[PDB]
Amino acid sequence: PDREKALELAVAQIEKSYGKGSVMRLGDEARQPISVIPTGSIALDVALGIGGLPRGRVIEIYGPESSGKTTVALHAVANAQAAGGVAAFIDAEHALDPDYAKKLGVDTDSLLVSQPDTGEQALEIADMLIRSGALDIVVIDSVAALVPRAELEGEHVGLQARLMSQALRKMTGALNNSGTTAIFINQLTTTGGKALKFYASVRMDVRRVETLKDGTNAVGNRTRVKVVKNKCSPPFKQAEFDILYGKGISREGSLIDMGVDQGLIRKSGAWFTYEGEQLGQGKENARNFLVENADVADEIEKKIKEKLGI
Ligand code: NA
Secondary structure (H helix, E strand, O other): HHHHHHHHHHHHHHHHOOOOOOOOOOOOOOOOHHHHHHHOOHHHHOOOOOOOOOOEEEEEEEEEOOOHHHHHHHHHHHHHHHHHEEEEEEEOOOOOOHHHHHHHOOOOOOOOOEEEHHHHHHHHHHHHHHOOOOOOOOEEEEOOOOOHHHOOOOOOOOOOOOOHHHHHHHHHHHHHHOOOEEEEEEEEEEHHHHHHHOOOOOEEEEEEEEEEEOOEEEEEEEOOOOEEOOOOOOOOEEEEEEEOOOOOOOOHHHHHHHHHOOOOOEEEEEEEEOOOEEEEHHHHHHHHHHHHOOHHHHHHHHHHHHHHHO
8 A cells, every 4th residue: 555655656756857758557547648650450550559660769570581571661661651741761771672662562662762872871861850940750771781881891899889979979869859750670689789779669579470371372471569668658569460572561461360369350260250250261361351451451450459559
């Protein structure tokens, strides 16, 4: 009785002294912001607690080569644009496929792109963009590619981490004020991510778990994402979803998964049913049905959000 108040007091002082998400019980509900950047998977949006990526914060998305981390980033870009936002993409990798981006939903024509000469030029340009107040989202591809000028110009070793540290402490204020989200893509956490690990409000570990198949042909990959860090909602939640080659994150696939998870979609055998109606036999028909019938896919989306507050 007398200790329940001391803990509430303790938590409050921590909250006041260090910020809103400085301590949380893992069973807590998330405090919902006004706006967020949805990820493309409702499952991931739920895993993040606040229904998507936070605004005015640093995000890290890391994983192996071709884990899907860039696909997740590009979906964040599409949704930011889809709600009238402007996007930028700081590219030190030169791997971007705009056609793939296009099929996800990215307005590539409007997408600001920069291919900077050095790591510090990359971060300075990003910061220049962020302070404009005009961007909703900027993506940095990638952390490891942010090679310092000195190293590129042929000149001890350790200053890439120092470059990130310096840049992030300056960038973090610019992001809060602007309400711009910065997503750092990072490989396997790798060459400056040790500062990013503490500056990031969200960190997402992205991985392939199995190849999806249409008979013997590889159509895509089931993808798993763990929110290892989350300052806006309890951390350590994970989600799975499908990335289909040439299309990206199957929005409809996630609606079904979370649909059955939430009891909104029942399962009379291999038949997925919704509201007395039938959606399809097997996952693909249920999936294909939802894209062909966008109105019911939004019905299922609104219902899932209502049950969880997302
Ligand atoms: Na790409």
